[PDB]
Amino acid sequence: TATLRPYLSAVRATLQAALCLENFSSQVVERHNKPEVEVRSSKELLLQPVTISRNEKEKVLIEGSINSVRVSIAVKQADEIEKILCHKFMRFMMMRAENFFILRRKPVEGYDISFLITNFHTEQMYKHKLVDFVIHFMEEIDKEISEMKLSVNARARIVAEEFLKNF
Amino acid sequence: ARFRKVDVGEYDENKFVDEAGPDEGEVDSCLRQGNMTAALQAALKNPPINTKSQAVKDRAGSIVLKVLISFKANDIEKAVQSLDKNGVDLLMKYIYKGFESPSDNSSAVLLQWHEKALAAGGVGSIVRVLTARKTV
Amino acid sequence: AYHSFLVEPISCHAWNKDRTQIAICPNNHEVHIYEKSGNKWVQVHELKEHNGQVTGIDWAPDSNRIVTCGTDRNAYVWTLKGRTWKPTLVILRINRAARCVRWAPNEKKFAVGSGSRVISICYFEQENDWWVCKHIKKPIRSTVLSLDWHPNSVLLAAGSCDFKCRIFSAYIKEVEERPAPTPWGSKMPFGELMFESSSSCGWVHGVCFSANGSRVAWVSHDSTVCLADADKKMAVATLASETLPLLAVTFITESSLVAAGHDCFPVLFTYDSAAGKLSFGGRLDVPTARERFQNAGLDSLHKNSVSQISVLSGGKAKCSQFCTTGMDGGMSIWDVRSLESALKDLKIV
Amino acid sequence: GVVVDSGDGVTHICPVYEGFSLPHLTRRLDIAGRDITRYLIKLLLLRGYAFNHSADFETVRMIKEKLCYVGYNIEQEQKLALETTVLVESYTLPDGRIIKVGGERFEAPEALFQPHLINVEGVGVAELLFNTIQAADIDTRSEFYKHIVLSGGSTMYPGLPSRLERELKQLYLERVLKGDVEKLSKFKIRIED
Amino acid sequence: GRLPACVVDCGTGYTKLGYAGNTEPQFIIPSCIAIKESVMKGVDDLDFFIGDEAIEKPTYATKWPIRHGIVEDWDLMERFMEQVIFKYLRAEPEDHYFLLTEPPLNTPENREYTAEIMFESFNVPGLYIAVQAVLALAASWTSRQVGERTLTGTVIDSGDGVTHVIPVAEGYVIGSCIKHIPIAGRDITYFIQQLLRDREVGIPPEQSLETAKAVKERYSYVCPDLVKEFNKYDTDGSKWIKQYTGINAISKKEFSIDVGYERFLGPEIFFHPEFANPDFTQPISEVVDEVIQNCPIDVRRPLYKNIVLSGGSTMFRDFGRRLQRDLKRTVDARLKLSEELSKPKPIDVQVITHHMQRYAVWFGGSMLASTPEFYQVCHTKKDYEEIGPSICRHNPVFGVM
Amino acid sequence: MILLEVNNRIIEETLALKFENAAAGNKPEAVEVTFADFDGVLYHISNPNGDKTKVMVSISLKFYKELQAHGADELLKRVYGSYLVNPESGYNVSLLYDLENLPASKDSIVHQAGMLKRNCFASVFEKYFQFQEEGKEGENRAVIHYRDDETMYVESKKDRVTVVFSTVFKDDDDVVIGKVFMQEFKEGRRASHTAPQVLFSHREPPLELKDTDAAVGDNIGYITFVLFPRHTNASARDNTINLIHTFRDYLHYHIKCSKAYIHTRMRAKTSDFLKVLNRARP
Amino acid sequence: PAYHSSLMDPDTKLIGNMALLPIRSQFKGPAPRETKDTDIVDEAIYYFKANVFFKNYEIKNEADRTLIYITLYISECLKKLQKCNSKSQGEKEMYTLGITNFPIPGEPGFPLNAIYAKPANKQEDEVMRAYLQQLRQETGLRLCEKVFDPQNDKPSKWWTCFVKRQFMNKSLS
Numbered sequence A: 001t002a003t004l005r006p007y008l009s010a011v012r013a014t015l016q017a018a019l020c021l022e023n024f025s026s027q028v029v030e031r032h033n034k035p036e037v038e039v040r041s042s043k044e045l046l047l048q049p050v051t052i053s054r055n056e057k058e059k060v061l062i063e064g065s066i067n068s069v070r071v072s073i074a075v076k077q078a079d080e081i082e083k084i085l086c087h088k089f090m091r092f093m094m095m096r097a098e099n100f101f102i103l104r105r106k107p108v109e110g111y112d113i114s115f116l117i118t119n120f121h122t123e124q125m126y127k128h129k130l131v132d133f134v135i136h137f138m139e140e141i142d143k144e145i146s147e148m149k150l151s152v153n154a155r156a157r158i159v160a161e162e163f164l165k166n167f
Numbered sequence B: 001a002r003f004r005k006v007d008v009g010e011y012d013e014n015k016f017v018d019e020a021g022p023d024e025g026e027v028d029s030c031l032r033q034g035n036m037t038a039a040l041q042a043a044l045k046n047p048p049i050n051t052k053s054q055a056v057k058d059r060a061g062s063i064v065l066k067v068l069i070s071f072k073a074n075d076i077e078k079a080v081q082s083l084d085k086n087g088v089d090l091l092m093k094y095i096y097k098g099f100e101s102p103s104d105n106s107s108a109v110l111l112q113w114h115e116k117a118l119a120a121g122g123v124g125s126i127v128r129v130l131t132a133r134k135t136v
Numbered sequence C: 001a002y003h004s005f006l007v008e009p010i011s012c013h014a015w016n017k018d019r020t021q022i023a024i025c026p027n028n029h030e031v032h033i034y035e036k037s038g039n040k041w042v043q044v045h046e047l048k049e050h051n052g053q054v055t056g057i058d059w060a061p062d063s064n065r066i067v068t069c070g071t072d073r074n075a076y077v078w079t080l081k082g083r084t085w086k087p088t089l090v091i092l093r094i095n096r097a098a099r100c101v102r103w104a105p106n107e108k109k110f111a112v113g114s115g116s117r118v119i120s121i122c123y124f125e126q127e128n129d130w131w132v133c134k135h136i137k138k139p140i141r142s143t144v145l146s147l148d149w150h151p152n153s154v155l156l157a158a159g160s161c162d163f164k165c166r167i168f169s170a171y172i173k174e175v176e177e178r179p180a181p182t183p184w185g186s187k188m189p190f191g192e193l194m195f196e197s198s199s200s201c202g203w204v205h206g207v208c209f210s211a212n213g214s215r216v217a218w219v220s221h222d223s224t225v226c227l228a229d230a231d232k233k234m235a236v237a238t239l240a241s242e243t244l245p246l247l248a249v250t251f252i253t254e255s256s257l258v259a260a261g262h263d264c265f266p267v268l269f270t271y272d273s274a275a276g277k278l279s280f281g282g283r284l285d286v287p288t289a290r291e292r293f294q295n296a297g298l299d300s301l302h303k304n305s306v307s308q309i310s311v312l313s314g315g316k317a318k319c320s321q322f323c324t325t326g327m328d329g330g331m332s333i334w335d336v337r338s339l340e341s342a343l344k345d346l347k348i349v
Numbered sequence D: 001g002v003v004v005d006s007g008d009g010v011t012h013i014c015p016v017y018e019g020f021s022l023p024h025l026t027r028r029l030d031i032a033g034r035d036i037t038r039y040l041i042k043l044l045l046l047r048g049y050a051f052n053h054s055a056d057f058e059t060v061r062m063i064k065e066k067l068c069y070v071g072y073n074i075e076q077e078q079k080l081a082l083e084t085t086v087l088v089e090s091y092t093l094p095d096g097r098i099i100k101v102g103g104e105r106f107e108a109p110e111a112l113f114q115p116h117l118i119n120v121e122g123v124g125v126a127e128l129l130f131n132t133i134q135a136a137d138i139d140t141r142s143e144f145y146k147h148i149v150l151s152g153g154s155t156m157y158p159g160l161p162s163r164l165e166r167e168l169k170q171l172y173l174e175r176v177l178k179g180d181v182e183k184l185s186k187f188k189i190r191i192e193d
Numbered sequence E: 001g002r003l004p005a006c007v008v009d010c011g012t013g014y015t016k017l018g019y020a021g022n023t024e025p026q027f028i029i030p031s032c033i034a035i036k037e038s039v040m041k042g043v044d045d046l047d048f049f050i051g052d053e054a055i056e057k058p059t060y061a062t063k064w065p066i067r068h069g070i071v072e073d074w075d076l077m078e079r080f081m082e083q084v085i086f087k088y089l090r091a092e093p094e095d096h097y098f099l100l101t102e103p104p105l106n107t108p109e110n111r112e113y114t115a116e117i118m119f120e121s122f123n124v125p126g127l128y129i130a131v132q133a134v135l136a137l138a139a140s141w142t143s144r145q146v147g148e149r150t151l152t153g154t155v156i157d158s159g160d161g162v163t164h165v166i167p168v169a170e171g172y173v174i175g176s177c178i179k180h181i182p183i184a185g186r187d188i189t190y191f192i193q194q195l196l197r198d199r200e201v202g203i204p205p206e207q208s209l210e211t212a213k214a215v216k217e218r219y220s221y222v223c224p225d226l227v228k229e230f231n232k233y234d235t236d237g238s239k240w241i242k243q244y245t246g247i248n249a250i251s252k253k254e255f256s257i258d259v260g261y262e263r264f265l266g267p268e269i270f271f272h273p274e275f276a277n278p279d280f281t282q283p284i285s286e287v288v289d290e291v292i293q294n295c296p297i298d299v300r301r302p303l304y305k306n307i308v309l310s311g312g313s314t315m316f317r318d319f320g321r322r323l324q325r326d327l328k329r330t331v332d333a334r335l336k337l338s339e340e341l342s343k344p345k346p347i348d349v350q351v352i353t354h355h356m357q358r359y360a361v362w363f364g365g366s367m368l369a370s371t372p373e374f375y376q377v378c379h380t381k382k383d384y385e386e387i388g389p390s391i392c393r394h395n396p397v398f399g400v401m
Numbered sequence F: 001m002i003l004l005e006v007n008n009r010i011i012e013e014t015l016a017l018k019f020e021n022a023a024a025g026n027k028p029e030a031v032e033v034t035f036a037d038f039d040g041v042l043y044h045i046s047n048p049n050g051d052k053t054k055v056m057v058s059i060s061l062k063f064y065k066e067l068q069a070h071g072a073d074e075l076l077k078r079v080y081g082s083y084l085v086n087p088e089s090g091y092n093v094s095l096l097y098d099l100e101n102l103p104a105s106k107d108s109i110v111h112q113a114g115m116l117k118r119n120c121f122a123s124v125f126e127k128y129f130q131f132q133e134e135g136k137e138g139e140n141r142a143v144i145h146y147r148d149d150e151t152m153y154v155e156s157k158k159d160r161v162t163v164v165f166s167t168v169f170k171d172d173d174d175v176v177i178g179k180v181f182m183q184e185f186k187e188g189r190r191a192s193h194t195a196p197q198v199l200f201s202h203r204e205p206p207l208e209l210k211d212t213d214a215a216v217g218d219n220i221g222y223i224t225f226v227l228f229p230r231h232t233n234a235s236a237r238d239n240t241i242n243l244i245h246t247f248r249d250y251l252h253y254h255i256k257c258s259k260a261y262i263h264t265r266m267r268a269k270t271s272d273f274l275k276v277l278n279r280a281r282p
Numbered sequence G: 001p002a003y004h005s006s007l008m009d010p011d012t013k014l015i016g017n018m019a020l021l022p023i024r025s026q027f028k029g030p031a032p033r034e035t036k037d038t039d040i041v042d043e044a045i046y047y048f049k050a051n052v053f054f055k056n057y058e059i060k061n062e063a064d065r066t067l068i069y070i071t072l073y074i075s076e077c078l079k080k081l082q083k084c085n086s087k088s089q090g091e092k093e094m095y096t097l098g099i100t101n102f103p104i105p106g107e108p109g110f111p112l113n114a115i116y117a118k119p120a121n122k123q124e125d126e127v128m129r130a131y132l133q134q135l136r137q138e139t140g141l142r143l144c145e146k147v148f149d150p151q152n153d154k155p156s157k158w159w160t161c162f163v164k165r166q167f168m169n170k171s172l173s
């Protein structure tokens, strides 16, 4: 994995730069407060979207704004069983978005999972722990997808033998 | 039901509105003679900052990317350290430009540039990649 | 010297004349006033009137009046009647949240920057017994994030989300008289644009006029600090930082600046008048008989973004103590002379 | 100018020309506070919460006052509710049980602009206000438009003023300019409060 | 379709399963699952048992996934449905619409969790989650006392843990007004177990509950008046004092005991909780009155005319009778004081009893899932995939109109 | 439970209860039950003509005529004999138990009643096993549409008997989990060298069927079992039929338990992420 | 609710706040003479088995205090009666019990001092003391024709079981 540490470093530094947020009232609608990267009603409040890619398939998209940051991840999916496990695990978490609270209910078109960190989050939580968590998450969903692949294969071998051994 | 379809904000007279490349041959010249650092500093010259065509900018990126890949891992720290702060910040911008075009494991060595470019410019240079209105 | 008033962010703060009381907005609709007693802080007042989050507070020293502005588009001038602060409404005539407010040095006017892309200059009219305001609109195009008055109480510096730092004339001939000449210009009619920065990127979070008012500084989201010298044809010295953006800045001498932001600690900047160059003076927050004895994963006093800085004593000409409040609900008091001992390598000016 | 009043009882668009009211040109809207509270109760049932229209009316009203608002761009508001959790808020009931309210915060008030939602005929307050001023003294219109004032409890919804202005413009642009977005910046609308 | 829908009612103590159309559950098993607990690999997750088979497996631990009518362990609950479907019902889940039940006040999120399991684990083609109280009302339509269908009524559900008085209006439970009573089947057993200890000698200590539960289920009932009852048992003890005989667990010997007073004393603690609970004293008749008075004035009478019973603890002979008499005394008294302090219209109080009370919920579900309308109000797998699991937050009530 | 049970529990628990009460001498209660089994099977247990002293058990299969064309009627009669009466309208096979005339060992007829579905399939297998054991080759293969869109082919060859299943995976992702299991079956000999050879073909039927109107599709999967004399002979026969007729439902059963186990993994991991996320709070 | 007395007559006199109810008895005391076929001691013995289970009892009038006292006492008689082998020994121990001086309103040891008015003077003290003794005596002798079944030397277990239960959670002991 000569390419994993370098990749996670670039991604971490970008997130450190992007998570510099502040509370911001709406210039467009009176008494409304909204994440600018989502509504995008004021171009001057949106930062430049940047991408960090490890290879053609794995990458992270970071879209900043004055009071919010959208983070999208393209997860490593080597084969079919990995594609469906990832897609199931990602949906699993998104369905529990209200408890995750920094999770988007749907990913940005083209990615597997997206976070939506706001100034309210950076006010209540150490932004460096949030950066830590996004890196930890990227490493852990890959380990879990691998453990899941092993589990399914292992149980299938036993299921096939129990049936076959009974003839 | 028809009239709520048009975005009237688009004509809000209170909105916000913001205010030709490196020498292709000069770069090749340096690259062909194996003078990498020279090729880098030459490619980081007169960037298509104020140009309107998305083609001119992509052309400039291609040249910069072509130089970055041509490098040898151990010869990255040296070249980066021969740039003035404004150079590093432009480099950083190009490094993030390349990430949008992975291929032949180009991203692998680009992550090496990003590492060194960061060690020289700090997170500040990445910040200046995000805040830019006129980009590469 | 750190103290924690709460865990949520301190939206903004303001000290009274004696620096014996501090008003703060504990990330809500109120303003709490704390007073020191021995070495503890006690809450003496609670100003409830705003219908929205309080975004700015300023305390006129001589007249002892507090002015607040909020996301509810209002502004209030608070007057102390005996033992209780009484508010007075000020129609700002804006339809978006107010973001910042500052009393002019002459305590005759106060300015409110807002999301309406305008600056509301307010003054009182005795004949009708209430406050009125005029608008400095052009050429502001986005939300006004920061304000700071020139010592003559006429020139006004402003930083907005359209990436510009500007100096205007907030001359109200009905409460003050013709302003003396300034190196920024001779003609200062109301709303006159005296100066405009050239940068095309970077929200301007903070702006500050020097003690004599001939120099103006500001920090942008692009991790840079700038200083425009009026006595040099408004030339601009810029210094691109290698770290995170700064959100607040102040002068501590005519050639010294102290700033803080998303890195969570105060840093020093020095201006070389001759070379017209800004230089990094170093981080100011580094980890007797009682001292020798006595002596989250952050090595800084504040544990989250520092959003405001203010001089406590010694003014902007020769500051001896300054204050910082932040998104971590803390308030720090820094002593300039101590910081000089602990760091021999430290300059200043 | 024009006074748009909406309370717990009903909504009225009362025009007033240099002096007094003009019963002619003064229309009513069959939607108000009580109706919005009722719709919120229906929306909260479709969310899995057991609210009774008569037993918990006062409890849902208090939820409406503290959490509801008027969306500016509905299409954009539904995206926030559908793709994110920024609109979700917790609310404790008198017995201590906690519920979570999201999209329904702007969905209920929307009835004011789209009557069919609560199944009532007519057009939205915005469209009603437009019509009123149009079929009136062509030499007082511009005066009326830049002098609209909201009053009543059912008009304090965050963002309401912005929403009205956005629609009045959308109605103008076409129903009096045939889609010509050229002369649009010279249209002055300023709603007080 | 040619195939009937599956009806599964998971309660805290027992789970009732079967096919729609039938009058009674095809199975009634304890809501427990036994597993090995001493990281999981291979197929350790499939190595388990449920119901009676789980209660005493030598090398397995027994877990109860449901507490207070709510799922507290989704991992276990999901495995439990694996056997409910493939071992007992033997239904290919993809070919059957399912009807599940939930206690009132189950969070909307729990319904999404249920839907995730049914649609994504078992791929069911359609799902409906009904609230138990409402099915209980539907069940009462089988009674002769009712000639008009209606889903407005007060449900008195008493199982073995706690008793619930649930007001319901037009198919929707009035949650803000629900009240719970700390007197259930188990309490009736403990009290009876206490009465025996003070009188009958010879009952094997280790067989204390056994005997008490037996007496409760075989000889208990509700009486109209305690003194006139004690009086009977003394005037002609021959007719009222029954006998019971059990066998000593460790000696297979045979012991007999007289079963007297507890026959009517046990069930009595519903109407006089103070007899057994030092912390609760409200008679069940007063709780119902309170709950109904806490509801909208305009729905109070309909509630009084349609109080429905549900659960085993309501099966005692004359339970309804005693409840209705007591409720009519409290309500009529109130109207007396009023008229005097001055003439209200008499309020009709009616407790409904029917044959399907024991498993009223399952029966209501079974009958409703047998109708054509059940197939329209169900959420299909196609709507689950397009719109999402949030569509299971609400289930259109049906059956009346 | 790894292997699926063959006997239907509703039938057994219903007959056992009625038989126990009949023997106790209790007045017979009425019975009326409708239930199902895997693959479109509908059962009905009732009292013919209201006579509560008689209990009937009927089974309905949409494809019965196909099993019948392969000796199903004869086999069921040998097995049930006098209990097998004329089929109740709507069903294909009916068993009648007289509560007033039960054998001495009732726990033996109850067992066979629980296997009604299994016995209906038995004949087709026995008929082709028999062919194999008699060298009769070239005999037309049996085609049993056990589900609206699933078919089972049986054919006897000189030294081997092959059973082919054409199965559908409605859920697109179930095809992928299925492939994982099918791959393990195709390598089963590496664990049981004497067991049947299993083949798997995704989207297309084995070439011998490429000419019939066999189904082709992204969600179709063909599984082939090759049974050898040691499996088809008179000694193993019953056990072998008990396994092979449950295979289809065994495979789909395990794919679904596989997904349920993945869920417990996701619950544990998602739960752990949330604990870490919350430690980012002061 | 619990079982309350109905012997409170407008002519019924009082001793403290306890109703001085007439009883049919030979024993001495200030208890009036009852002519009717039922007196407070009967009413208390009849209702006993029921009332004894109640924890709360609403005092509707002074007769209920008298009724409550007999109830608590009947419980005291069962402790003793529980341990004896004859309707004879019971009567002899039931006599001794009745003579023993138990606590009275106002004195510590007497539960319910908040519900029973104490003797306002020495005359009331002796009169009340004697009335309570008379009630105890009559209740005691009247309780043996019940507790024992024709099989003498046998206290019916259907009366011996209530020995562990205390009306309103109080006891004269």
Ligand SMILES: Cc1[nH]c2ccccc2c1CCNC(=O)c1ccccc1F
Pocket: D048, D049, D050, D051, D056, D059, D093, D094, D095, D097, D098, D099, E105, E106, E107, E108, E175, E176
């Ligand atoms: C349960 C409850 N308590 C109330 C107090 C005041 C007004 C309404 C209510 C309700 C009914 C609405 N709540 C629910 O349906 C609910 C269900 C599950 C979990 C929490 C809930 F609040």
